[PDB]
């Protein structure tokens, strides 16, 4: 017999035999899958075989099932399908292995996974007896692994009809309540039942019809009995027999009590029960922390749910004695483990990611934030007094001081305002304590980082009812920045930069610190960003841009601005962004920082910045030439910076000629040769601005080079996405070269019209309409003649283009483009061309009979239909709808259009007014 050789060959370490056995095995399956499946199932059932072979047999069946069992698995190879006779065999073998507690855990877990796969396909059509066998094992054989298996396949197999009406729901709760009421049941047996209780509660939480009287009542007795039982379980004590098991037991009880409290009506979990379990939860916090003499992880995993319950019943009044127990217990659960202290100290980028709120980990430190952030004001005020009091007494205990400062940070993050007369006394002592921490020379690293981060919260929360707040803000901000500078810890440097962001949230440092100190803090923050930007990584570079944005926002606009700082801000925008161009958050913020560095710029100042920056840009554009301008994340970045530099033009006329001399050729080469979609989109955007904003006299010799670029973009393998910005480029060329372009307008416009008709891309048609609306404003008559004479698919372009224009009007973006198109359509309306009267465009959408949702599968027999209306009629309705949504300027424009037209009834406006809807006339009456 062969399967033993394959099992040994496949299980062996050497790859050569592993593939031979696997390829031989798969080849055998492709011919007699039934025989291979039968063999693997006889190798897993045989106890005489070694555990390694038995485990591997179930390990192989795990994968072979997905490939040879049913088409329901995407991995089905369709070579052969195990005969139904063989299926009934292994499906029997798997249940025997899984439901037998005497089997090894690997065999029980190995077979359990196979049943999970099979049951999701074979139940109930091909495996009717699955649940009958599982419930037989639990009820009669008292199998523990049967409850573990039943939990895994519960949601997949038991439907609402099976659960409520089918008796599976009541059958399970009887099993659950029998186990929990049996005081002699082992913890592993009670834990299994409580996990299975969570499966039932999930079924009862939501179901297809709440109003069913039989379902509504059945839920009531189940929840009422659950809370009765869960109360009994929390009263039990097992000593130190097994703390890891007891902690899991408490975890599942509180997971169930946080579900019953949150995913059910207030009726089912009353306040008197909330008070009863609130007292138990606080006492479990004391018990859980005292048990902490993988124990710690289970202590922290259990504490997440105990605190998650307290967050739910946080509205209940906490006694002063109970607040002490919560703070004392959280001070021990919210302190950083030695493992996390090492992680943060060794790599400060992990500290910044967690502090910035971007780390994926969620632990007790985050559930304590959710608890303190949820408290109401009557309790939040009293908690602060407890936390503040503990700090002034724990100031000399560095073991707990960091934890307490975090609880204080969570309290001060609450949206409610802390009030009460005594808080004035506690606050002043708290402020002095924080100052001592900063001044302390021997303070540990992470306590100092937390004190730096908590101080902004204290000032923000008590911005009012705090004398001399401004001196404190200057005193604290200066002290925290100094600590960052004279320290070799990058964690403290990044802690101060994050703290600086919090300072700017509540305080206008320009008005608080003053013109001189504000510039000094800008210098200090810029120095700190340089120090940490050297080793910044991952989410740190995103944070540094956010901080740098704040620094840039405070640079003076008044004369005698610090030119040294501005050159340092420019250097940081490129340096931080150049480090990780692919980072999206840095890319967007880098442009924002660059834009606000150029919002108001003089000629002399602008020339200096382009002189410093442009030479780097030229090299990046030229460097990518050898790569055929493929999608380099750095190449995109500079093309986005060039656009910002070119878009934010200085006052006093056009851009300096140097830009035309140096950027024109690199950009032209990018557009001529590059094939990437993103590169062409950005390059065309930058090139369009270059032509638009540069002096015509200095660009005329380059007019020929533009056309080779333009003609290469109009029609080629260049997709519609790649030629997204060709609309503005054609507008820019037409605007600055209108006299020289007169011969070439016809062939340029013809290509644009064809592109507009074919493209379904919202952004491409919006841009390509920028050419038409520009031409219509320039000469509405001429545009129609070009469209009337030109034909696509043997029909006039006018009907096709105008219909595209009308549909595109509904999704145009930007006030500039909405004003432009409103003017363009208005010019067509005033023209009253006879050819424009024969075009018919889609009006209101005719709904089909009934209320059926028309999914795309129904498009064949329920296509969208529109009432055909004359174009001029749809133009007026479109403008009316624009005024309605809005409910010199867009509204101003549409209103003057309605006034001028009404004063003369041009183009039959009187007739259109008569056929408009009554609601439209009411809106139109705002102008009339």
């Amino acid at each position: 017999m062969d399967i033993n050789e394959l099992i040994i060959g496949a299980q062996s370490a050497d790859k050569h035999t592993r593939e031979v056995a696997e390829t031989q095995l798969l080849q055998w399956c492709d011919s007699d899958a039934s025989q291979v499946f039968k063999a693997l199932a006889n190798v897993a059932l045989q106890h005489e075989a070694s555990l390694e072979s038995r485990q591997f047999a179930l390990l192989s069946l795990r994968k072979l099932i997905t490939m040879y069992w049913s088409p329901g698995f995407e991995s089905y190879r369709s070579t052969s399908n195990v005969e139904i006779d063989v299926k009934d065999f292994i499906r029997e073998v798997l249940l025997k292995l899984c439901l037998n507690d005497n089997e090894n855990t690997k065999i029980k877990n190995g077979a359990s996974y196979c049943i999970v796969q099979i049951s999701a396909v074979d139940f109930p059509d091909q495996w009717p007896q699955l649940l009958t066998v599982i419930y037989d094992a639990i009820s009669h054989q008292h199998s523990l692994n049967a409850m573990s298996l039943l939990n895994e396949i519960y949601d997949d197999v038991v439907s609402e009809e099976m659960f409520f009406e089918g008796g599976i729901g009541l059958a399970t709760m009887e099993i659950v309540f029998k186990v929990l009421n049996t005081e002699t049941s082992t913890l592993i047996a009670k834990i299994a039942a409580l996990k299975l209780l969570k499966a039932c509660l999930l079924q009862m939480s939501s179901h297809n019809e709440y109003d069913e009287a039989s379902r509504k009542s059945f839920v009531s007795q189940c929840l009422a009995t659950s809370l009765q039982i869960l109360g009994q379980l929390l009263t039990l004590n097992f000593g130190n027999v097994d703390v890891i098991s007891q902690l899991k037991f408490k975890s599942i009880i509180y997971e169930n009590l946080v579900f019953i409290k949150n995913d059910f009506s207030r009726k089912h979990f009353s306040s008197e029960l909330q008070k009863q379990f609130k007292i138990m939860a606080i006492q479990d916090l004391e018990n859980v922390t005292h048990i902490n003499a993988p124990l710690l992880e289970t202590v922290h995993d259990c504490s997440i749910y105990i605190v998650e319950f307290l967050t739910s019943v946080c509205t209940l009044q906490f006694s002063v004695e109970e607040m002490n127990k919560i703070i004392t217990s959280l001070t021990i659960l919210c302190q950083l483990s030695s493992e996390t202290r090492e992680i943060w100290t060794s790599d400060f980028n992990t500290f910044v990611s967690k502090e910035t709120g971007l780390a994926a980990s969620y632990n007790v430190r985050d559930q304590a934030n959710e608890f303190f952030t949820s408290l109401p004001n009557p309790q939040l005020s009293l908690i602060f007094k407890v936390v503040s009091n503990d700090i002034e007494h724990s100031t000399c205990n560095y073991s707990t001081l960091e934890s307490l400062l975090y609880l204080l940070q969570c309290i001060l993050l609450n949206d409610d305002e802390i009030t009460g007369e005594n808080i004035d006394q506690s606050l002043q002592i708290l402020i002095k304590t924080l100052e001592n921490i900063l001044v302390s020379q021997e303070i540990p690293e992470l306590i100092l980082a937390r004190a730096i981060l908590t101080i902004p919260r204290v000032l923000d929360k008590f911005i009012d009812a705090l004398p001399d707040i401004k001196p404190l803000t200057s005193a604290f901000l200066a002290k925290s920045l100094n600590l960052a500078l004279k320290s070799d810890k990058e964690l403290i440097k990044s802690a101060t930069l994050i703290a600086f962001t919090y300072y700017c949230y509540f305080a206008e440092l320009d008005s608080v610190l003053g013109p001189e100190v504000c510039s000094e803090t800008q210098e200090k923050v810029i120095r700190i960003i340089n120090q940490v930007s050297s080793d910044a990584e991952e989410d740190t570079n995103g944070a540094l841009m956010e901080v740098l944005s704040q620094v840039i926002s405070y640079n003076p606009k008044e004369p005698h601005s610090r030119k040294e700082i501005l050159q340092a801000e420019f250097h940081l925008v490129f340096t931080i962004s150049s480090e990780d161009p692919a980072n999206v958050q840095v890319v967007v913020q880098s442009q924002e920082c660059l834009e606000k560095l150029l919002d108001n710029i003089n000629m002399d100042n602008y020339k200096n910045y382009i002189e410093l920056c442009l030479p780097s840009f030229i090299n990046v554009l030229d460097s990518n030439n050898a790569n055929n301008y493929r999608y380099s994340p750095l190449l995109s970045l500079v093309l986005e910076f060039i656009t910002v530099f070119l878009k934010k033009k200085p006052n006093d006329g056009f851009l300096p000629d140097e830009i035309n001399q140096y950027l024109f050729e690199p950009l032209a080469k990018v557009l001529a040769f590059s094939t990437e979609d993103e590169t062409l989109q950005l390059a065309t955007e930058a090139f369009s601005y270059l032509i638009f904003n540069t002096d015509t006299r200095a660009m005329e010799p380059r007019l020929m080079d533009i056309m080779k670029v333009l003609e290469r973009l109009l029609s080629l393998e260049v997709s519609d996405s790649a030629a997204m910005n060709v609309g503005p480029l054609v507008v820019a060329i037409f605007t600055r070269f209108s006299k020289e372009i007169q011969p070439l307008i016809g062939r340029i416009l013809e290509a644009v019209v064809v592109r507009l008709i074919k493209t379904q891309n919202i952004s491409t048609e919006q841009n390509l309409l920028s050419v038409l609306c520009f031409l219509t404003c320039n000469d509405p008559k001429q545009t129609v003649d070009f469209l009337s004479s030109f034909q696509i698919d043997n029909t006039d372009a006018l009907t096709l283009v105008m219909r595209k224009w009308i549909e595109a009007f509904e999704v145009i973006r930007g006030e500039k483009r909405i004003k432009e198109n409103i003017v363009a359509l208005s010019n067509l309306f005033f023209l009253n061309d006879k050819r424009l009267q024969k075009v018919v465009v889609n009006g209101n959408l005719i709904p089909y009979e009934g209320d059926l949702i028309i999914t795309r599968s129904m498009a064949k027999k329920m296509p969208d239909r529109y009432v055909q209306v004359p174009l001029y009629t749809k133009i007026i309705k479109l403008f009316v709808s624009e005024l309605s949504f809005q409910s010199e300027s867009v509204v101003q424009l549409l209103v003057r259009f309605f006034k001028e037209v009404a004063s003369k009834d041009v183009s039959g406006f009187h007739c259109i007014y008569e056929t408009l809807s009554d609601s439209e006339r009411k809106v139109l009456s705002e102008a009339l």
Binding site: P71, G72, A120, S159, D851, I853
Partner: protein
Amino acid sequence: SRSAKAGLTFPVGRVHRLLRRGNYAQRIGSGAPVYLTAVLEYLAAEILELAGNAARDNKKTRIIPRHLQLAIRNDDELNKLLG
């Protein structure tokens, strides 16, 4: 609720409140929550239809997660939208 008036089975009122308390804009137009609700309802109808079709392909009368993730992957348009 306003869902019946617009012909929807999703909460028009609660989507409006979600838009307001979300601090997305200073004001929300009356036609915004009705429009966004119909879009959410349509997508839930698309996913349920394709997921349901997968269930019936296996003669199942229940949309378990396997069917749900199998439908989105096979439908490219949903695959791009929802991965």
